[PDB]
Amino acid sequence: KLEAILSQEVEAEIQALLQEAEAKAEAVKREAEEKAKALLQARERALEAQYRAALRRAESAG
């Protein structure tokens, strides 16, 4: 019938839009994990540096 056409113009948009917004809610969240990981990768190198420098200084000093 004619009401069955109407349910199909909607039922198409409301999956196109909600599939799109579940891949932005994916995407932001993927970059959020890859940032936190990298802000701790730079933190890891820094600490190392400070320890290699530190020990050399105490060897020289002594």
Next chain:
Amino acid sequence: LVEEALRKALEDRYLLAHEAYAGGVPALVVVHRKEVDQAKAALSRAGVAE
């Protein structure tokens, strides 16, 4: 004539309604959006226009 033309053109998912006024009938055909061109084409072949 108009009803036949519309029915073949537009299947059974078109709505043709009419209501009188004393003499002829002003008729309204109601059709889905994007089925506009087809709907028009059907009126144009009978010689009836908007």
